[PDB]
């Protein structure tokens, strides 16, 4: 049994940060049509205390992933990703949105760009060492579920007219004492006449621009994970 | 006259299944340049690497619907959601 794309429930309160619901907003937009966006109106979840919720709110939308956004003094723009495997969480990661240097913030948006149709798969770019670290946990972690959250439907077809964006997850390279930086960019592919055969690309930066620090992890057990990977 | 190749000092790696490029080398982000400046050179680098690979390793089939490109299948083994049956 071949699964197809992996559903995804995006999730938020009514007192969600604004550019986190831009965030949600446009991951919905990206993975969609397999993909629901629901405000909880009632009030909030939070899933390193318990994942009852976040279980049942998955399984009632028939969802693989949950992508979550919430805020509070001590975690603040917080975007936490969780997978389901067989009714129950897999593996959470908690994504803390950092500042931008300017300080311009995260442009309202429904959608990555009026240049990309909704819906296409994208182009993936993992940069940076630590995604080649087997050691490091956390990388192995983020990769998987990146992946997983973007990958849509896979086949083994594509359009060559499709391959119109790209995102690009960064690692920043690691330092001893300090969380894990990454990067998330979106680029609307340009090709161009460069004298050869194949096209010279450019890119134009579109979509959010976002830089995260990582927080709490939660490991899937090593038995559920092995059977999960059963393929 | 643009150059389409893309030299780094550690190859690319594939996952054409999932349209996927890895550029292991290092995320150079020198701290003069902005930050997606610094960002948007190495993704350039890395999805010219990718367009390379897909155009020149991937079987292109044109027809009268269109000019599609086959996959090789995806070699990230990634988690199911639900148990095999």
Same mark, same amino acid.
């Given at each position: 049994?071949?699964?197809?794309?992996?559903?995804?429930?995006?999730?938020?309160?009514?007192?969600?940060?604004?550019?986190?619901?831009?965030?949600?907003?446009?991951?919905?937009?990206?993975?969609?049509?397999?993909?629901?966006?629901?405000?909880?109106?009632?009030?909030?979840?939070?899933?390193?205390?318990?994942?009852?919720?976040?279980?049942?709110?998955?399984?009632?939308?028939?969802?693989?992933?949950?992508?979550?956004?919430?805020?509070?003094?001590?975690?603040?723009?917080?975007?936490?990703?969780?997978?389901?495997?067989?009714?129950?969480?897999?593996?959470?990661?908690?994504?803390?949105?950092?500042?931008?240097?300017?300080?311009?913030?995260?442009?309202?948006?429904?959608?990555?760009?009026?240049?990309?149709?909704?819906?296409?798969?994208?182009?993936?770019?993992?940069?940076?060492?630590?995604?080649?670290?087997?050691?490091?946990?956390?990388?192995?972690?983020?990769?998987?579920?990146?992946?997983?959250?973007?990958?849509?439907?896979?086949?083994?077809?594509?359009?060559?007219?499709?391959?119109?964006?790209?995102?690009?997850?960064?690692?920043?390279?690691?330092?001893?004492?300090?969380?894990?930086?990454?990067?998330?960019?979106?680029?609307?592919?340009?090709?161009?006449?460069?004298?050869?055969?194949?096209?010279?690309?450019?890119?134009?930066?579109?979509?959010?621009?976002?830089?995260?620090?990582?927080?709490?992890?939660?490991?899937?057990?090593?038995?559920?994970?092995?059977?999960?990977?059963?393929? | 006259?643009?150059?389409?190749?893309?030299?780094?000092?550690?190859?690319?790696?594939?996952?054409?299944?999932?349209? #996927?490029? +890895?550029?292991?080398?290092?995320?150079?982000?020198?701290? $003069?340049?902005?930050?997606?400046?610094? &960002?948007?050179?190495? @993704?350039?680098?890395?999805?010219?690497? #990718?367009? +390379?690979?897909?155009?020149?390793?991937?079987?292109?089939? $044109?027809?009268?619907?269109?000019?599609? &490109?086959?996959?090789? @299948?995806?070699?990230?083994?990634?988690?199911?959601?639900?148990?095999?049956?």
């Amino acid at each position: 049994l071949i699964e197809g794309a992996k559903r995804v429930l995006l999730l938020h309160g009514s007192k969600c940060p604004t550019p986190l619901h831009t965030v949600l907003k446009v991951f919905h937009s990206l993975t969609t049509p397999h993909s629901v966006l629901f405000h909880k109106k009632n009030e909030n979840i939070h899933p390193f205390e318990s994942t009852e919720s976040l279980e049942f709110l998955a399984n009632k939308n028939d969802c693989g992933m949950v992508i979550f956004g919430s805020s509070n003094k001590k975690r603040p723009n917080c975007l936490t990703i969780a997978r389901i495997f067989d009714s129950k969480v897999l593996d959470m990661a908690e994504l803390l949105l950092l500042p931008d240097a300017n300080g311009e913030g995260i442009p309202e948006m429904n959608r990555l760009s009026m240049h990309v149709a909704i819906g296409l798969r994208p182009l993936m770019l993992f940069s940076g060492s630590a995604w080649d670290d087997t050691t490091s946990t956390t990388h192995t972690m983020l990769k998987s579920m990146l992946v997983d959250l973007f990958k849509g439907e896979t086949s083994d077809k594509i359009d060559v007219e499709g391959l119109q964006y790209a995102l690009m997850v960064g690692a920043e390279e690691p330092t001893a004492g300090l969380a894990p930086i990454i990067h998330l960019r979106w680029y609307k592919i340009v090709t161009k006449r460069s004298g050869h055969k194949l096209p010279r690309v450019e890119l134009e930066e579109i979509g959010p621009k976002l830089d995260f620090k990582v927080g709490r992890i939660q490991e899937a057990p090593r038995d559920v994970m092995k059977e999960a990977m059963k393929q | 006259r643009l150059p389409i190749t893309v030299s780094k000092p550690t190859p690319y790696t594939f996952d054409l299944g999932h349209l #996927l490029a +890895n550029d292991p080398n290092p995320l150079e982000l020198p701290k $003069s340049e902005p930050l997606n400046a610094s &960002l948007k050179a190495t @993704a350039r680098d890395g999805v010219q690497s #990718l367009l +390379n690979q897909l155009l020149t390793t991937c079987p292109i089939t $044109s027809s009268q619907q269109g000019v599609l &490109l086959t996959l090789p @299948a995806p070699s990230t083994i990634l988690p199911r959601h639900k148990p095999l049956p």
